[PDB]
């Protein structure tokens, strides 16, 4: 029910599996040989994604899952200008 | 002219 989005630095980001399948790429990486990990939580190595930006990716997962089909007005995702470019390439690669 | 100006 939880996946372990390990970044390039080494920071494991144990986020819920339902949160992780927000991104199509993580869903693909958890399908096939990626789901064969028997040790409960699946580890998804991200040697190209640094930890400081994968943390924002996981925050976006927990943000979009909680704010999906919301009846009230929705706030924009707080994204820092100094991380915006790195999180843009992280959003393309993850297709989220 | 027959009327006044317009409001």
């Amino acid at each position: 029910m939880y996946v372990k989005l390990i970044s390039s630095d080494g920071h494991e980001f144990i986020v819920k599996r339902e949160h992780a399948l927000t991104s199509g790429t993580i869903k693909a990486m958890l399908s096939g040989p990626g789901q064969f990990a028997e040790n409960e939580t699946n580890e998804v190595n991200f040697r190209e994604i640094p930890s400081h930006v994968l943390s924002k990716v996981c925050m976006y997962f927990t943000y979009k899952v909680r704010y999906t089909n919301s009846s009230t007005e929705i706030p924009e995702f707080p994204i820092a200008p100094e991380i915006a470019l790195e999180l843009l390439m992280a959003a393309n690669f993850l297709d989220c | 002219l027959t009327r006044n100006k317009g409001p």
Binding site: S51, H52, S55, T62, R66, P81 | -
Partner: protein
């Protein structure tokens, strides 16, 4: 609802909890994830132990400072049967130094 990042050394649990829920349910979540007893878990809210009796709302976590966009971090330590251990939360990384464009140079 309250959103937390339970960080111990490099792990970062992106879990959620109710504002009226207590610390025992959060330690049971960590049971469900890192398979560790709650008696071996001391949770730190910025260098401050959370007693198991109190709730998440009382100790400082609210639905305004711990939004899903920017969840509020909480520490974690493991006992290993030897007087527990100190908090060793490792910061993620340094984003590349993007200087102010209008700085005189």
């Amino acid at each position: 609802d309250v959103f937390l990042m339970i960080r111990r050394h490099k792990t970062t649990i992106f879990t959620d909890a109710k504002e009226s829920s207590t610390v025992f349910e959060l330690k049971r979540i960590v049971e469900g994830i890192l398979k560790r007893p709650p008696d071996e878990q001391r949770l730190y809210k910025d260098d401050q132990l959370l007693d198991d009796g109190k709730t998440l709302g009382e100790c400082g976590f609210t639905s305004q400072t711990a939004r899903p966009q920017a969840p509020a971090t909480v520490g974690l330590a493991f006992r290993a049967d030897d007087t527990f251990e100190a908090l060793c939360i490792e910061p993620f990384s340094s984003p590349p130094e993007l200087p102010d464009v209008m700085k005189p140079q």
